Amino acid sequence: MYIERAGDITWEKAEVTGNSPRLDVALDESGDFSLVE
Amino acid sequence: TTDGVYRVMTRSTQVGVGVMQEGVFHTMWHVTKGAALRSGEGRLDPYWGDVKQDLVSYCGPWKLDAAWDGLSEVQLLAVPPGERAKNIQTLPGIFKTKDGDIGAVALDYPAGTSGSPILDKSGRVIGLYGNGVVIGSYVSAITQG
């Protein structure tokens, strides 16, 4: 396993996409998120 | 050792992404499962890890501490395998948990993008991408140490 540089950490004046859902979730000890009703 | 975003590779296959900042490499635990990493001729050794946060840091303690402000758009700096780094701007949704709200981005990129940083308007890393839920649209928590 090895690493290779891929870019700067910069904000780019970028495509805009994606929803913004509000979800009820629980997180268990294995780090797994799950939906809650 | 240089600050920036990095591909996490294996022998080549891209298994994840991480952030180098202040000499510490940050990625998600499920990307490396805490294994040592090669950086040129040097070795990065795991320093702190937490399976429940799904985070790991190498050569030092976790350095990233910005957080989402709850209103502004953010940018996912996705590093997909075989593609150049690209910025995807979005407004986070919210994971509502028993222990408070977590920002979340409803963006679905290849699994080798796990560990890509999410940035605020000031260019600071507010979390890493790649641990989340399927609503099948994937929604990733903005995971911050």
Side-chain angles (χ1 to χ4, degrees), chain A residues 1-11 14 16-21 23-28 30-36, chain B residues 2-10 13-32 34-37 39-40 42 44-83 85-95 97 100-120 122-123 125-134 136-145:
Chain A
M1 285 194 99
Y2 64 99
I3 68 178
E4 289 183 13
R5 189 164 198 285
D8 293 342
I9 310 276
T10 300
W11 183 281
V16 185
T17 202
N19 286 345
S20 56
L23 314 164
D24 291 326
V25 313
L27 165 70
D28 71 11
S30 324
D32 285 320
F33 288 108
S34 65
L35 295 175
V36 173
Chain B
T2 325
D3 277 0
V5 62
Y6 285 67
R7 300 177 197 274
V8 176
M9 309 291 287
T10 192
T13 297
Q14 179 173 324
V15 300
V17 179
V19 172
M20 194 71 96
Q21 177 164 318
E22 302 165 67
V24 170
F25 197 63
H26 309 71
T27 185
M28 311 212 68
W29 177 273
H30 76 268
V31 171
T32 72
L37 302 169
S39 190
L44 319 166
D45 304 300
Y47 188 97
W48 167 87
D50 185 322
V51 157
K52 186 180 158 122
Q53 293 168 63
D54 195 28
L55 291 177
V56 61
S57 74
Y58 289 75
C59 295
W62 188 269
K63 299 298 194 177
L64 315 184
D65 55 346
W68 181 43
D69 64 13
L71 297 182
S72 323
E73 285 169 332
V74 304
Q75 285 191 351
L76 170 68
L77 170 46
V79 187
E83 290 188 33
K86 50 174 179 193
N87 292 62
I88 304 99
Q89 190 162 319
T90 192
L91 179 86
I94 306 204
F95 283 2
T97 80
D101 296 351
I102 306 173
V105 296
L107 300 173
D108 195 350
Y109 287 100
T113 69
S114 280
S116 299
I118 298 154
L119 327 184
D120 66 12
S122 312
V125 181
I126 58 172
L128 305 184
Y129 168 88
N131 190 21
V133 299
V134 165
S137 180
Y138 182 79
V139 182
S140 165
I142 300 177
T143 299
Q144 180 65 290

